[PDB]
Amino acid sequence: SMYPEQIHRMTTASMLREWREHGGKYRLEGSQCEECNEIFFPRRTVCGACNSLSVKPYRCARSGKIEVMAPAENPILAAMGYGETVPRIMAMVRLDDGLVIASEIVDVCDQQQLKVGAPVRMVIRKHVRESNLAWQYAYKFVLDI
Amino acid sequence: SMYPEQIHRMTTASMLREWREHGGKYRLEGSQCEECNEIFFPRRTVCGACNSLSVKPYRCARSGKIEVMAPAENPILAAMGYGETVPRIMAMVRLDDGLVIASEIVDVCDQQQLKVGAPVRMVIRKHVRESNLAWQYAYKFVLDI
Amino acid sequence: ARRVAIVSAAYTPKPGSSRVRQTFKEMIVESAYKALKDAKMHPREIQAVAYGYHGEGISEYGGLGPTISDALGISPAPTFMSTANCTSSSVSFQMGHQMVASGEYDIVLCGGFEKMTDHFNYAEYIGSSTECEYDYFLGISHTDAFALATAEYFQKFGYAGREADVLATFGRQMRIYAQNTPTATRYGQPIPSLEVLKNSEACGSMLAWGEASGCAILVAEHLAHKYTDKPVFVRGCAYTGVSHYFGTRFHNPTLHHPGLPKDVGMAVSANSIACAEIAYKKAGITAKDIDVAQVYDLLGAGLIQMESMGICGKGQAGDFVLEGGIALDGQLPLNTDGGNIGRGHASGCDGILHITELFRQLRGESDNQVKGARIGVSQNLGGYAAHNSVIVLSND
Amino acid sequence: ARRVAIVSAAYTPKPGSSRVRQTFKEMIVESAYKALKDAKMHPREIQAVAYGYHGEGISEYGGLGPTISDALGISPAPTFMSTANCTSSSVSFQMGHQMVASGEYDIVLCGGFEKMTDHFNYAEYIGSSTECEYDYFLGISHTDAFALATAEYFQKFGYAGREADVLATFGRQMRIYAQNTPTATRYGQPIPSLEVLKNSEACGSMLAWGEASGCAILVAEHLAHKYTDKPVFVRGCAYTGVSHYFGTRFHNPTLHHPGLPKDVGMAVSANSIACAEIAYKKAGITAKDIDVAQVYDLLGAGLIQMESMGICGKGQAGDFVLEGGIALDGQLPLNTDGGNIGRGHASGCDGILHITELFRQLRGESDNQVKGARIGVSQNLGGYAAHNSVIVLSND
Amino acid sequence: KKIGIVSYGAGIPVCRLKVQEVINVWKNTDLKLVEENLGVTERAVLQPDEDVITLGVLAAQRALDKVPGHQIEALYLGTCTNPYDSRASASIILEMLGSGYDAYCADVQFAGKSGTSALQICQALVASGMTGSALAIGADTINRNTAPGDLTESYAGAGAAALLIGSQDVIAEFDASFSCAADVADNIRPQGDRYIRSGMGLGSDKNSIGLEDQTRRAAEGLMAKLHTSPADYDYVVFQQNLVSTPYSLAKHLGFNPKQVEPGIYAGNVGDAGSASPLLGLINVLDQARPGQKILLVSYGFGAGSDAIALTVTDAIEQYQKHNKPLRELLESKIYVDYGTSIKYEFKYLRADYALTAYL
Amino acid sequence: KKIGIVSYGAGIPVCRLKVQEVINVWKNTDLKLVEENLGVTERAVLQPDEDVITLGVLAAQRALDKVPGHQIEALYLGTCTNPYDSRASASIILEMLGSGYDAYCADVQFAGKSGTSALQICQALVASGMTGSALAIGADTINRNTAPGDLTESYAGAGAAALLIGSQDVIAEFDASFSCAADVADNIRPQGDRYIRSGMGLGSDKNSIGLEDQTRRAAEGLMAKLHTSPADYDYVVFQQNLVSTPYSLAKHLGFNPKQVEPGIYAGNVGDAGSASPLLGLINVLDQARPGQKILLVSYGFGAGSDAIALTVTDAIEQYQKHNKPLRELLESKIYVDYGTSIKYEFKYLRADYALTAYL
Ligand SMILES: [Zn+2]
Ligand SMILES: [Zn+2]
């Protein structure tokens, strides 16, 4: 602050990284194959089913159910930018189109509604800030009831 | 500053790294083999000549000559923490014990004395600050005349 | 094709403990020169090295091969690096096997290390080896994946009311194996009661995490007699790769392996199943033939791998453990050194940690010996089974 | 031991230019599927991959193997990673050669990539692959090492007054080779005069640095006819490792290679000499036999490697270049694609950049063809020749 | 075909902090004053993963969900607590909404009237024929930019409101507007400062020279233009930093309590700045009837005021048929204590450079 | 009667700093690159008593001096270097101008396109009939918000431009416009940060994904709407952070040098941000002829682009009769050294609390 001597840092992110993933992270866009119609998340260049390069963006279903859930409460494993909210409710969310997303559940107003099979919907939230100072935004989920 | 939200950083150094190298970096300590007396910089655990594990710290000679020298002036290659001094005079210094050290020449008061074969001596200087906030100190060289 | 023998294997003891007074170079040298001594071999007889670690983010040292060749004192002999999560050593072992089997090198040192304490807080760095833009940068860890996998296993195979019992029985058996194993972090510790374990962290199934280096020395069959009376042969290996992204465990059309189960996920690791089937076909064995094994233990991951590996049927590993099946007198003795819970875990070294205990078992030198052991198997994984390795060793 | 053939080789064109609109996955797929098409091969025929990059510090993606196996659409087929400076692809090529030669895999894709623009300023990251505590953390770069090496070469072999002439003649020949090579970054650029080059940056010997992925497809000899009429065979390879620390170039008792020159340093690369001698012995050739070559060009490094490789005597490479020796009608045509100056450089891809032009030369398909080329050689280095690779290819 | 509001949406944080939790710590104001006179018993707390963009895109997406497949032609973000001081947060919201890139786009700032100013811009773009439709957002994180121990802390909140303007299926026709402004530094936030600052002591003296002067000037201006008086309006909506503020301004301009009441929402929210007049309007439209007349008069410190007159249409009945009202949305809440609120809103003086989460 | 520009004005700081003065200290870029390729030999230095408001009110007052007794109906201030982050600097300028309080008023922010965005807002307000006229200002102190040692320091400048929109005595008819935007973080300034930051290394890679993409998209969009091509325009005006930028964009979009040259002013000024496209337009209108066609395409990092098409009228000849051109204004200058520039722009790290001027 008072002494502006540059501090060592191996890695600094270019804006290019997040720029290319705005579809995936703001809009839950994966990929669909034009030849066989198989769907994937996250986005990709080659269809895994048939190895076609004719692949297009696909808007994943933004509603789903909690497939599996696990609290994260261990201070030892608190990542920088995620230390303030404890517990965090980590979940695998099964979307209505069949895909599964690794995320977390937030804004739980009634704890008795937080259970396996509970319906959820996607929301845009602030995530850990980028190493180039830009705010990071991406998906999380809330209970939808 | 005003918004204390933690920023993402893959790598943060433990104090352990520099703690173990104070001999090498503050005192120009390499290694000498107890069986065959060969000398090495930087410090090491196995003698390269004879593969003995009987190796001890060795104070390298702190006087030497410039073997080869090259200005670093290209802004594109300015490392963080080293952008303020331009040019930097990079050199391979041949110490009086025969070892060679990669370093730089500083405090050149008479430019006509800066040449190949010029005598130099070790000095302790501040280097790029550590990712744990500790000041980094290590060797550089000056002309000795 | 020619056979490849392990002539020695060794690691820096107590791998669930840290070595803050050593550098990574010093630590690598310790296990390397120990193994060289065990084999009655000079360092300059080593023709190549295959070595593993997590990556350059821990110590800020990249392009590490030459640095290792210099540290060991073998230059110009090359070191081929491997960067593959907790499977780094397992992968480097497979690389060394290829180096010898090819005829290009006759004597090869395989291994790996991890110096977590060089990083201020390694726990938050590890996530960098995942599908980073969609997990690491959203604060999702590997440990989250294992917690979820365990929850899926128990909820879907009807273990409600016995989760604590299963995890505690597992962790207790690991502690029993570690108690009498001198290289284990829990060597000599008293065995806590099942009830004490149930009321402790992760019902007693949390691993012990520290620092270690390790290596095994591979030699062409025709040379092995120069270095040992009792060589351990590599029967077959498989290494397999699927997406790091945890969601893909439930739906991965990219994974082409015929005859997988209909329903796959975290509790049923498709990548691990495929890996085991490939490995066993190459080795000329089936699960029936396995006399002793090693798995990456942590929470319920040991159960999922017991099933993937073919030791018991889908959903039956919990009951197998409860019925005493992994004890020394049980149907399949498993993690006889104590595993990650008892012996300890150091990511890049884990492959060698497995291989060393199997090596010992197959020569009759284990502290918890399986009488008449002919076949030994290492099942190891990296990420949430994004990497998977299966290595099959025999003694004839 | 059985022979291994290259059936196709390809890279993303203009590797001295950046591809900011692509991700690294997209970029890898481009060259992979191009090579697959050239070979008349389906992706699912690939049994394993060996792939290289600088490290996890650029894109913050570690444990990359599974991620690549998923991107290419080959799961469960494994990807073995290589992290070895500018030699990453050269090393991965050698790994693939071992994989096929061993009999463990019959068809293997070898390659590498670099996506420098994922890092804000890659130039200051690269130093992380050195003897970091004694160079990187003191602000000492690889580029400093090359500047110093060049200065030592010229000061000690009596080139005072002709330094500019040597570097400019070299850079001009690279531009001449690049002009008519469609995959080169300097394709179609007019050839500047020798005088214009002397008065420009680094007297015209500064490389063009961008982004690229590349790969070659290796197949067991008995299968090669299915994929090509004109296979290129791997005669022999060597990979060698010495300390990254630049000081050790002058005094390295750790380097055990008999019959090295008495006086070694930066201008005389002992590691590179050792590497070439080992490689040639394995390949059954001498320098006399080499019809065309590739070297890592940058400042005077091309000269130092010409000497290490055995093409001309100590201190004579500058005069060799001035006398026209590396031109297409010269005694030894070198970097016929344009090299790093004309074609371009992308660290992890560079090994394949060399191998592709040699592959083309040995089939008569090069844009600057060496008539009747039988033997082609890639000399590549990593760090200041801490890594060194020599790869020898033939056409019969 | 008349032009006006087609659909709307709102975004409100779920975390809540009871006023007494703040007063127990600072003891710097009367609990009875804030709860009974000012009318605020609890306030919205911003979570660590929430901000103007997260609330704004929630509100906007809720408005656009009413018009399937809508292609965005213009998007204006009214805020005085912008996440960026250079670059437009509006373009980030546009990217997120994923409904077209070819749009008139900017951030708009005049304190609490930013949202109404954005609305006027959107109306002008449609009425001019420069676009067929336009999306206005009003959003603020007043809590985030109010200092611990500030006299306003206990009732600083946050919120977002989005209004789609068009000429197809219009539920409230935009009849006319009148704006005024001047240099009145009753509140400021200098470039750099995180916290919004007062220019003088709080009370009716400060209110008379800013809030009341500008609100009166705009309201009287618009009514003079339309030849109307307070008796001609079914509803009146004012700035709602506090529940007391609309009632006070109504008494000052000759409106009566039953004209104000249907716009009141903020007793459990606190001050949502740019969002507050738009949220009042939303609260009216949720229950209004065809034919009814609305007068909306906002207030931005600095200072100035935007007055807008609207007429509710027949289409309001269909819009209301399957609609989640704001009243229902505001029932969703999670209580937190003072210490937790300060953690969540990043108001502890922690280290400039963090080594881990907790070191 | 067609609607458009009636009068204009400009405000530029008089202090100047030669590029070599910065390069001598930092040695972080080539003198030849900046002087010859980028085309900037010196840059504007902000004095301690100058800012966005001082420049803005100068430009605005110069535009209104052309229309004696004009009553202001709307005033929009486009800037990304705003003196206030809450409250509208526009209301301060309005107060200073002393020509009415009953005006639509706000600050508008989208980086370098803030001024053109304000202009579009004003056009919409007049074309809609919501006002009879409207005053747009574009102004930035890029110098003040560029850090010492930044690669862009040697060519960071400052400036203001004001354009009055109306339907009486119009000198350039506003024919049509097209805007686009997206999330492209090529430059940012997070809330709090004084200095504008790059999102990646400088060069043609960064230019291709922001500057060129958005400029091309808006220009092609507008030309497609009007069924025109570059050959149909007498003048083209782009963002002028650097003299090289308009020529580069012209080459990229199929315009030729003679179409660009008359808009070039910045060789002795540097980057004036929001002002730069408007200053280019002013420089054209100072010498243009009746009938001529102008295409204006701005660029805001973040990112987005505003394209506007204009036609010059017969009234331009009378307007030009007694007019001080921008070319003449830019002849007024005072040279200062690097140390003095840093003092004047408040870029020394002095004590947070001052005891006297010098203690
Ligand atoms: Zn398909
Ligand atoms: Zn010795």
Author numbering:
A (entry chain E), B (entry chain E): 2 to 146
C (entry chain F), D (entry chain F): 3 to 398
E (entry chain A), F (entry chain D): 4 to 362
Original paper wording:
A bacterial multicomponent acyltransferase from Pseudomonas protegens (PpATase) catalyzes such Friedel–Crafts C‐acylation of phenolic substrates in aqueous solution, reaching up to >99 % conversion without the need for CoA‐activated reagents. We determined X‐ray crystal structures of the native and ligand‐bound complexes. This multimeric enzyme consists of three subunits: PhlA, PhlB, and PhlC, arranged in a Phl(A2C2)2B4 composition. Very recently, the scope of applications has been extended to phlACB, which encodes the cofactor‐independent acyltransferase PpATase referred to above. This catalyzes the reversible disproportionation of 1‐(2,4,6‐trihydroxyphenyl)ethanone (monoacetylphloroglucinol, MAPG) into PG and DAPG in a divergent reaction. The composition of the multimeric enzyme complex is thus best described as Phl(A2C2)2B4, in which the four copies of PhlB mediate the binding of two PhlA and two PhlC dimers to form the complete oligomer.
The final structures showed the hexagonal crystal form (space group P6122) to contain two copies of each of those subunits in the asymmetric unit and the orthorhombic crystal form (space group P212121) to contain eight copies of each subunit. Thus, the hexagonal crystal form contains half a dodecamer in the asymmetric unit with the other half being generated by a crystallographic diad. In both structures, an analysis of protein–protein interactions within the crystal by using the EBI‐Pisa server yielded a heterododecamer with four copies of each subunit as the most likely biologically active oligomer of PpATase. A cavity analysis identified four, large, contiguous cavities per dodecamer, lined by residues from one particular copy of PhlA, PhlB, and PhlC. In this heterotrimeric arrangement the proposed active sites of PhlA and PhlC (see below) are adjacent to each other on one side of the cavity, whereas PhlB (especially through a long loop formed by residues Glu74 to Val87) closes the cavity on the opposite side. Even in the untreated (hexagonal) crystal, residual density was observed at the side chain of Cys88, thus indicating that this residue is at least partially acetylated. Whereas the conformations of most residues forming the active site of PhlC are similar in the structures, Trp211 in particular stands out because it adopts an open conformation in the untreated crystal and closes the cavity upon substrate binding in the soaked crystal. Inspections of the cavity observed in our structures in the vicinity of PhlA suggests that there is indeed enough space for acetyl‐CoA binding. However, key residues necessary to catalyze this Claisen‐type condensation (a cysteine and a glutamic acid residue) are not present in PhlA.
